[PDB]
Subunit: 327 residues, 3 copies
Amino acid sequence: MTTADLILINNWHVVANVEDCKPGSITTARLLGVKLVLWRSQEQNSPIQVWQDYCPHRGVPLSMGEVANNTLVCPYHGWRYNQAGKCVQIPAHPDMVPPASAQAKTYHCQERYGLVWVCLGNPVNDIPSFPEWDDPNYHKTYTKSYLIQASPFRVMDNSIDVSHFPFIHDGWLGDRNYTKVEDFEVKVDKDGLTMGKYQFQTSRIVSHIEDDSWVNWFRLSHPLCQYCVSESPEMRIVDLMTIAPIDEDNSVLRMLIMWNGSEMLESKMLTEYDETIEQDIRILHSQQPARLPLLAGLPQEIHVPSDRGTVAYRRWLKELGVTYGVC
Amino acid sequence: TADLILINNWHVVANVEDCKPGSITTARLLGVKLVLWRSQEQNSPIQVWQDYCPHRGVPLSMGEVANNTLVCPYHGWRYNQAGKCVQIPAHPDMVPPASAQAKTYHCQERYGLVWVCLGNPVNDIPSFPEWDDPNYHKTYTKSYLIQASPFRVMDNSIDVSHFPFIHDGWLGDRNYTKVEDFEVKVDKDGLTMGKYQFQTSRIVIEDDSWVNWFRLSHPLCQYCVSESPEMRIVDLMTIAPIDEDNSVLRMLIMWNGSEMLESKMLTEYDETIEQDIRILHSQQPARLPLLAGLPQEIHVPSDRGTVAYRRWLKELGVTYGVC
Amino acid sequence: MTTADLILINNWHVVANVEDCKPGSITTARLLGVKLVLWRSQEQNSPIQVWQDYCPHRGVPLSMGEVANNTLVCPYHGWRYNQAGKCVQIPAHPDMVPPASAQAKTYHCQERYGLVWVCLGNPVNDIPSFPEWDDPNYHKTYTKSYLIQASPFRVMDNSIDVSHFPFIHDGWLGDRNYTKVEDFEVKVDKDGLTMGKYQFQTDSWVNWFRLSHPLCQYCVSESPEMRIVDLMTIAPIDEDNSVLRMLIMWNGSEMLESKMLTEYDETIEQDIRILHSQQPARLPLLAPGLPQEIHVPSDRGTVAYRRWLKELGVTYGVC
Ligand SMILES: N=C1N[C@H]2[C@H](COC(N)=O)NC(=N)N3CC[C@H](O)[C@]23N1
Ligand SMILES: N=C1N[C@H]2[C@H](COC(N)=O)NC(=N)N3CC[C@H](O)[C@]23N1
Ligand SMILES: N=C1N[C@H]2[C@H](COC(N)=O)NC(=N)N3CC[C@H](O)[C@]23N1
Ligand code: FES
Ligand code: FES
Ligand code: FES
Ligand SMILES: [Cl-]
Ligand SMILES: [Cl-]
Ligand SMILES: [Fe+3]
Ligand SMILES: [Fe+3]
Ligand SMILES: [Fe+3]
């Protein structure tokens, strides 16, 4: 269940929140069909290692082992792997020089925005930018992680779509009485995919009742991360959505939300996002085919003008060479 | 995807009582997901469509009926009774594209059942002559979901020699196991099994001689007649072919005795159906073997009806749910 | 999934314990992808029949039927099959001689060591030897069966492996303080695979074992106090699933049985935790997106096992 797609293999993907990787801890993740083990030594400020979850001796998951000092120890015969992935001790043969092949498969890892980013290949692109991270005007919160039984590209398709707001988000992000979708612009260029400012009508639980005209904007430099800005005259909310491609048919959605208003709004922010993410997931789980259809049994997709963003997304994925999770 | 003999035939997918005005229900037929819906209007017709919005591929059954339209939950496109999209809410003054239309199927209500044809209905719905006979009362069994090929289910319903064993004490007698000779005929009226007698009393009592015959004009529907000196019982058994390996069995039962026998009737059928299902779920392979690992089937003279069934399916060019 | 490997099809495999097959009983098992029915008539000391679990009339499992006198009766139309597998009676036609094809597929069965051994092919090899069975100084006990979601050859590989004792069997077969594995000898010849004497420092137990059958292991463990032998059998359900049984004999007091069963239960379950996790599921042989296995000197027995399986031509459950 792996991919040759270099835009996917040679890119950075979130696999965990840094808060879930304590010193001395072992955790697991799955990315693009590969089983990962994440571990840290007990030392303060220890780096996070992200390896293939696999002991090359007899094929046991290293995640079933234990962290000892600065090493991860396999449970079956106790081979110890240092932070660089090299076996430094074979207990049955304490004096031998361990073979060069006694080495875990290691991956590039980088903590950014409080998230653990992993690259399984050779990183040609940087981690997506998130300018408000360093802005002290902005408070932050993290949603829980949502496991979704849909293609990661269908999950992103739904997050680019704006015309569904008055229907599945009626009463939250739209209003069954204002269903018309105002004109907006979309561009695919060196910045990636950008949806220009899009105004829509709704009151929101995180603001005042009369603050009922919102304007959204977003950019994907990476096909599975979205930087979204939602702004009213009273408040500005930004978020970094990341979709972890577990395999072709399963995804993990995470959202890092920041806002330039009272820190007291955090509970309402998480409530709104939980409500709307779950409304989206009900649709996502139902869509067929599972793979995202690109532009070209079941009838072909129909496109109307307010689909210009999701059409541009399908065009972009084709231009990027994506074959994983798309059809 | 099934053969054209199955595609161009009528299959029961629901009881008309399952489909109230304003309601949405679902069914599956020959691998196709179906949505059934009715407006709120009195005596409104049932629409049966493929359960699929062509915009972004959401099941229309997750939507709602509004007036005389079905509305998709995702972006609110509205489909009239003919399946044409009449409104795209994001663009209220835009004429919907001609491609914006649900795939619709033929639907007819008959005998209180919802019949569907996914193709072109060359054949008629099977006949059921007792339906309008004022001497006969009617009842419907519940539907039975069966994890077996629909053609295995029908094979078991054509089989008569198993009565003294898995229906001992209901349709057969373990002391009377011999199967007297009978005639079977396959012609343009389908498969008919001639009269055959089996010595057993039924709960529907010295009435222990029943003469049965049945006809299939349609490989997945069976019209069964059972008559004693005291009473005549007929039934229409319909097998909905969900896919190659799964079936829904329904029976419509009519009888010319007292209507107070209904509860006992439903119990007899429930008992014998579940006795059959226990065998059906166990048979291997799952798909019905036609005439020519696991050994080939063996046929004895009392299998002539189930042998003729397999020959008929081959003549009709059935490849779906058979092996 | 079935195999053509002759070392597997033409060999004997344990499918049941004899005490599990009482007179008049019907039980089921799977072997090498085949569904089996085991049955016995009600008469005393009746033989055990082992057939493919399949009525050739309409494909019903015979195991859903009943034993009547000396016959197994299919539940659907009541065809009666005698102890040789021949259909003797078709009740729809009481006076008819059944078709010659009306016959169960029967397999060779033999009771030995209190176990039911089955050969699905041509018995070329004999059942493995177990000398202490005939020794009145030795008591016997049987573990329960263990269903393991791993290739049977992975299960046997783990049983030949000795260097894992201080880690997953710390406190039972090894000691985390003594992890170095001393030199030992292994031989593969016509008698199969023999591991020579080795001892684990935790007085100490001295052990050796032999496989003449690639899925059966004869183990010997000796300390100054007593001697324990066991016959470990691994039934290959399919390429990815196994049933582990042990027949244990010892010449100490009979009262040790309960503790020994618990010790075996503890260590078997420690092994199963590893076996269920190993990837790939099939045992990798030598010299063929996961890296290839690494071997150190203390792996000499499991290396010799992989070499043996290749020369035996095993393709089922290996990769
Ligand atoms: N659950 C969601 N909340 C929304 C916020 C943006 O703010 C607003 N008002 O939409 N964040 C975000 N990434 N997106 C993409 C899709 C949809 O706009 C949304 N998904
Ligand atoms: N459960 C079952 N009851 C029986 C009744 C008999 O028919 C009548 N009319 O009583 N109906 C029917 N379709 N069949 C087919 C096989 C078997 O005779 C049976 N299956
Ligand atoms: N669970 C296990 N207990 C051990 C006993 C030892 O044998 C005796 N005779 O005591 N039996 C056996 N088959 N083996 C092989 C590996 C390991 O020595 C062991 N596995
Ligand atoms: S399998 Fe990891 S040390 Fe042997
Ligand atoms: S998916 Fe049905 S209206 Fe968009
Ligand atoms: S299936 Fe066994 S007797 Fe008919
Ligand atoms: Cl119609
Ligand atoms: Cl009446
Ligand atoms: Fe949404
Ligand atoms: Fe029956
Ligand atoms: Fe072990």
